[PDB]
Structure formats: structure tokens, C-alpha cells
Design a protein around this ligand. Sequence first.
Ligand SMILES: *[C@@H]1O[C@H](CO[C@@H]2O[C@@H](C)[C@@H](O)[C@@H](O)[C@@H]2O)[C@@H](O[C@@H]2O[C@H](CO)[C@@H](O)[C@H](O)[C@H]2NC(C)=O)[C@H](O)[C@H]1NC(C)=O
Ligand SMILES: *[C@@H]1O[C@H](CO[C@@H]2O[C@@H](C)[C@@H](O)[C@@H](O)[C@@H]2O)[C@@H](O[C@@H]2O[C@H](CO)[C@@H](O)[C@H](O)[C@H]2NC(C)=O)[C@H](O)[C@H]1NC(C)=O
Ligand SMILES: *[C@@H]1O[C@H](CO[C@@H]2O[C@@H](C)[C@@H](O)[C@@H](O)[C@@H]2O)[C@@H](O)[C@H](O)[C@H]1NC(C)=O
Ligand SMILES: *[C@@H]1O[C@H](CO[C@@H]2O[C@@H](C)[C@@H](O)[C@@H](O)[C@@H]2O)[C@@H](O)[C@H](O)[C@H]1NC(C)=O
Ligand code: AI0
Ligand code: AI0
Ligand code: NAG
Ligand code: NAG
Ligand code: CL
Ligand code: CL
Ligand code: CL
Length: 526
Amino acid sequence: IIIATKNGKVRGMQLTVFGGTVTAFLGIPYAQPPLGRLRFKKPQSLTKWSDIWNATKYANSCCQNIDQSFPGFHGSEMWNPNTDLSEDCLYLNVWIPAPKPKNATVLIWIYGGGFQTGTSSLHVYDGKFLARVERVIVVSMNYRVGALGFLALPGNPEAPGNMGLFDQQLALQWVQKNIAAFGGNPKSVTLFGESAGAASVSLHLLSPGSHSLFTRAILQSGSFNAPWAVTSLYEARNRTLNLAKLTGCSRENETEIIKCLRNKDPQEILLNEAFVVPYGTPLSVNFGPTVDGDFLTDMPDILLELGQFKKTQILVGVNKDEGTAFLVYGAPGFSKDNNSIITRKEFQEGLKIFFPGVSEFGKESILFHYTDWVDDQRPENYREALGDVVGDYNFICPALEFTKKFSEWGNNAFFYYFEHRSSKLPWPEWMGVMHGYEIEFVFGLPLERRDQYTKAEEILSRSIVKRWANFAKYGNPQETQNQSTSWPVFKSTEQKYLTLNTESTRIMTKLRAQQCRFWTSFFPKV
Ligand SMILES: *[C@@H]1O[C@H](CO[C@@H]2O[C@@H](C)[C@@H](O)[C@@H](O)[C@@H]2O)[C@@H](O[C@@H]2O[C@H](CO)[C@@H](O)[C@H](O)[C@H]2NC(C)=O)[C@H](O)[C@H]1NC(C)=O
Ligand SMILES: *[C@@H]1O[C@H](CO[C@@H]2O[C@@H](C)[C@@H](O)[C@@H](O)[C@@H]2O)[C@@H](O[C@@H]2O[C@H](CO)[C@@H](O)[C@H](O)[C@H]2NC(C)=O)[C@H](O)[C@H]1NC(C)=O
Ligand SMILES: *[C@@H]1O[C@H](CO[C@@H]2O[C@@H](C)[C@@H](O)[C@@H](O)[C@@H]2O)[C@@H](O)[C@H](O)[C@H]1NC(C)=O
Ligand SMILES: *[C@@H]1O[C@H](CO[C@@H]2O[C@@H](C)[C@@H](O)[C@@H](O)[C@@H]2O)[C@@H](O)[C@H](O)[C@H]1NC(C)=O
Ligand SMILES: [O-]/[N+](=C\c1ccc2cccc(O)c2n1)Cc1ccccc1
Ligand SMILES: [O-]/[N+](=C\c1ccc2cccc(O)c2n1)Cc1ccccc1
Ligand SMILES: *[C@@H]1O[C@H](CO)[C@@H](O)[C@H](O)[C@H]1NC(C)=O
Ligand SMILES: *[C@@H]1O[C@H](CO)[C@@H](O)[C@H](O)[C@H]1NC(C)=O
Ligand SMILES: [Cl-]
Ligand SMILES: [Cl-]
Ligand SMILES: [Cl-]
């Protein structure tokens, strides 16, 4: 019940899972709270404590704006924070099997949310099932988001940028120094994350200072070469200054600006973040990772191109309908409460929404590539096209390209295509296999027979949980006992990937080949 860590004793709590027991340590601090003069700075190391820290409840989530578009709707509200917001939020969680393992592979989850939302306490991030079923230790951490976590005056230590990434890195360090006390193997640590979490993982592969803090990596629906994932130093400054103006904090001393933003209450900073950009999109990441020269020494697309990353195995994948969710946060004619049949006209307006600073030619080129129909009289033609445009540009093609480029340096890569729509999915059917709705399967929620999943979903989750754990433990995401499809390595020539569904698991080649040539070879010129 009580574990000695290098900063003090922490008391956990016991959980009944599937007629077994898991020990949960919820809300262990891993940094000095970034308050007062510490706001915007890199996380500071923790001063020891002499008591028994009671790590029995999730801690505060980090300050963040909340999605209020669909009040009372579980489909959107399941992602909103479920603990008090506070700047005091640098805490982490540990689930360890009972009885205490001896040298367990460690899984470290990094949540997504566009670098502006998210929290490790979400129901769908509960590591108790993975600990019970696979005897891995699961660790998750809160990290600062938004301007509080990514405001950047590059070079300036009062706000160097990438603080949220250093939050995560400091947590990986805590696991290196402390997880053997919990029965974990610090030499067998697999990072996994979804969306901005997955982009973060991919950046830890690139950041020299994280190379000794983990073994292997899993990237779900996200990678750093996604167009929303890195802010340029131009944008990052223009956005910092705009925030200064919106808060009456413009100064000439760049340091005095920060000093002024440090006296602002968190709500005022939060309220102004949306407007630092002239034209946002539903995919806007106004404050995110930048080339700071510390966590990131060069523009990441160059490091990836020239093999400057940790050499190891990766497991990468995407969902069938990553794009659809964003279409009801601003695309015209769209709604979660109807079939969202849209006209050609509405499709073109939608592109203006999703590609606001893109020229008329570029937008026409997106239209051209996605509107050569198999049947021009199918009315969902344009609704589906816009979802795929957003999905292919923002998630699927960057992840495939990351996997091609990373595998070209000799490392084993595994790619999956998740195409199961949860039987409990509260969004409408036209949105399909949405962004984020593989997470419950990865965490083994369908293993709980009491929670209204089909038996088919329990079998799919159980297989996915095995492949993930085998990947973490052995670098190979196979299910070796139940006559399962073998998951082949991804190679830049053949480009084989594994489809994950309840019906049949299949091996296919060259996912979204035509679409991604447009997005990765032509569209970056416009
Ligand atoms: C860089 O910043 C300027 C300033 O942004 C404006 O003011 C901020 C405080 C905030 O409220 C933003 O929403 C504002 O747009 C941007 O310049 C503006 O650009 C728009 C259209 O591009 C124009 O209509 C405004 O008049 C401009 N205002 C000023 C003061 O110049 C600029 O677009 C930003 N981005 C880039 C890439 O330079
Ligand atoms: C699907 O609904 C959208 C959204 O409209 C809102 O939500 C509906 C469920 C309903 O409660 C409406 O009263 C709401 O206004 C519709 O988009 C609207 O379309 C009308 C006419 O085309 C237009 O006046 C509005 O500006 C549109 N609102 C937008 C674009 O945000 C859409 O037409 C509906 N489509 C189908 C096929 O039913
Ligand atoms: C930390 O917890 C100690 C033991 O708490 C015991 O177990 C928990 C689960 C509760 O059921 C509680 O009622 C029990 O007493 C406390 O003795 C101690 O005071 C706590 N420390 C702080 C700082 O709150
Ligand atoms: C725990 O294991 C250490 C070696 O780790 C090995 O390599 C990593 C990459 C994983 O694949 C893991 O499964 C392997 O066991 C030992 O050096 C260490 O002494 C062990 N500690 C124990 C047994 O308490
Ligand atoms: O983008 N926003 C919401 C969003 C995006 C993607 C999703 C994918 C799956 C399910 C969802 O509920 C999703 N919700 C709005 C919003 C943006 C930034 C801060 C606060 C709020
Ligand atoms: O708000 N949520 C997601 C969100 C918001 C804004 C984004 C902007 C750019 C890129 C993104 O991936 C974004 N994702 C909720 C949510 C969290 C995790 C999984 C599913 C849904
Ligand atoms: C003002 O800027 C100078 C450098 O231009 C810096 O050394 C100084 O610390 C700033 N003022 C304060 C009060 O920190
Ligand atoms: C393998 O099949 C058995 C039933 O024959 C099932 O109980 C078990 O959960 C399966 N294991 C995996 C990893 O899917
Ligand atoms: Cl498809
Ligand atoms: Cl082929
Ligand atoms: Cl082309």
C-alpha cells in the first residue's frame, strides 16, 4: 500500500478488477507547481517530502478551455476535464498489478487534445485494465497545455516554449528514477499516446534529452509532421505578441511582457488564446510545440528526413474517419443531429473554413482531387469528401509519411488501420470511426462485460491489448496463440498495414496511396 519514492513515501489504493486486484497510485506530484514566477518556465525539480503522500485520487487537471458546443452530450463531454482545473496540475498516476510485479514492462500514456485540452484522469485513460490483464505498469501524466504550456519567446527562459513537452519529459525521468520501486523495469518503457499525445511521442523520438528515458513508441492518430503539430517561430512570436496586446501586456522589454502576463489570472489568458490568430480553424493549435533550440534543436521535418532520431521500433496507426469530428465544429450544412448531406457549394465553403489562408488555386486543387466521383448522383458524395479531406491532410497522410521516413533508417515499424465503430458511439453513424474512439479499445474498456459492448468488441479489445503489450515488452505486436493474422513490418517499398476490426483482420498495402501523394508531394507547394 505504501511505496518509497525518491522524494517521499506515497500511499496507494487497491482496486478490484476482473476478480483480481490492481494497486492505483493516483496524483503523484512530479514537479514544483508552476505558479507565480514559475508560470511559463520549464518544470522545476521537486523538493522532498517527509510524510506519506496520499496518492488516492486524481489530481487537478491543467487549466484549459472547455468544449461547450454540445452541452449535455456525452460524445463531446467525455473529453472535457473531470477534475478541477488548476495551474497546480503537474501530477502523474501509476497502476501496478497485484501482487507487485518484479520487473514489469512500463507503458506511459500521453493524452491528446490538440495541445490545448486533455487530462490523464479521463475515464477512457484508466490503466487498471491493462495492469490487471497484461501485468504491465501503466503511467500517465498531466502536462501543461495551451499558452500556459507552449507560449514561446524563443531563446527567452521566462517563456522558452515547449514547457508542456518538458513536463512530459520530467515525468519520464520520474519513471526512470522511481518505477523500479513499484516493480517496474525502467529499461522496458513504451511511450504511447493519441493525437497531440502521439505527436508528443514522435517529438520525444527526436529530442536528444528523451532518448534515454524510453525504449519503444506507439503513435495513435498523430505525428509531428501533422500540419497542426508544430508552430513556427514566426507564428509563435506573432501569437505571443497578440496575446500581450489582448491582455494589455505589450511592453518593449520582452521580459517585462512575460512579467505582465504572470500577473494575469489564468482565466484571462485562457479567454484570449483563441484570438491570437486572425483566422482559426477547428484544427487550430494556436499555442503548441515550437523549435525552441532545447527540446527541439532543428525543424523536425529535417531531423526526420536526415535520420536524426532514436533508433527503435514504432507502432503507428490511424482511424478510418479521423476527419469527421471536426466537421461539426464549423463546417456549413453539418450537424451531429442530421445526416449532413451537403451540396458542392457547401463543400467549397467548408474548404474556406478548413484552409483559410490557402490560395484559390490550392482550394480548387483539393476539390479536384476529391470530387472525381464513382457516381455523381450519390448525395453523401460531398459530405464524405470533406471528412476525408480533413482526415487525410491532418492525420492519415502525415502518419504514413512519418512511418515511411522513420522505417527507412532500418527500424521495424508496424502500421494499423482501425476501422471499428464502437457500438456505444454517441455520435451519429455518418461520422463513422472517429478520431479518438480506438482509445477505449486500447485501454480494454470492452473487457468489462458490464459496460454494454458486444462480445465481438471484447474480443477485438482483448486482441489489441495483447498486441500493444507484446509490442511494449518484445517490440513485436503479434498475438501468437489464437491463430491470429501475423502483423507484418512496415517497409517503405511494400507498405503493409494491419486492419483492426471485429469481422476479419486483414493485411493490405499502400493505404490512401492516391490521396497522400496529393497531400505530401503536391499540396505543400501551393
Ligand atoms: C500577426 O498579427 C497581426 C495582428 O493580429 C491582429 O491583432 C491581434 C491582437 C488579434 O486580435 C488578431 O485576431 C488580429 O488579426 C495580424 O494582422 C492582422 O491581419 C488581419 C488579416 O490578416 C487584418 O484584417 C488586421 O487588420 C491585421 N491587424 C494588424 C494590427 O496588423 C497578422 O495577420 C498576424 N499574422 C501574420 C501571419 O502576420
Ligand atoms: C442539418 O442541420 C444543420 C444545422 O442547422 C441547425 O441544426 C439543425 C439540427 C436544426 O436544429 C436547425 O434548426 C439548426 O439551425 C443545417 O444547416 C442549416 O441549414 C439551414 C438551411 O439550409 C440554414 O438556414 C442554416 O444556416 C444552416 N446552419 C448551419 C450551416 O450551421 C442543415 O441544413 C441540416 N441538413 C440536413 C440535411 O438536414
Ligand atoms: C492519508 O491517509 C491516512 C490513512 O487514510 C486511511 O485510508 C483512507 C483510504 C481513508 O479511508 C481514511 O479514512 C483512512 O484513515 C490518514 O491517516 C492520513 O491522515 C492521510 N493524510 C493526509 C495528509 O490527509
Ligand atoms: C530487470 O531487467 C533488466 C534487463 O531488462 C531487459 O531489457 C529490456 C529492454 C526489456 O525487454 C526487459 O524485458 C528485459 O528483462 C535487468 O538488467 C535488471 O537487473 C532486472 N531487474 C530485476 C530482475 O529486478
Ligand atoms: O475542437 N474542438 C472539439 C473536438 C475536436 C475533435 C474531436 C474528436 C473526437 C471527439 C470530440 O468531441 C472532438 N472534439 C473544440 C475545442 C477546441 C479546442 C479547445 C476546446 C474545444
Ligand atoms: O478536443 N478534443 C480534441 C482535439 C481538439 C482540437 C484539435 C486541433 C488540432 C488537432 C487535433 O487533434 C485536435 N483535437 C477532444 C478529443 C481528445 C482526444 C481524442 C478525441 C477527442
Ligand atoms: C529589461 O531588458 C533587459 C535586457 O534588454 C534585461 O536585462 C532586464 O532584466 C529587463 N528588465 C527587467 C526588470 O528584468
Ligand atoms: C484466446 O482464446 C481464448 C478462448 O479460446 C480466450 O479466452 C482468450 O482471451 C484469447 N486470447 C487473446 C489474447 O485473444
Ligand atoms: Cl476507407
Ligand atoms: Cl500492392
Ligand atoms: Cl497528384
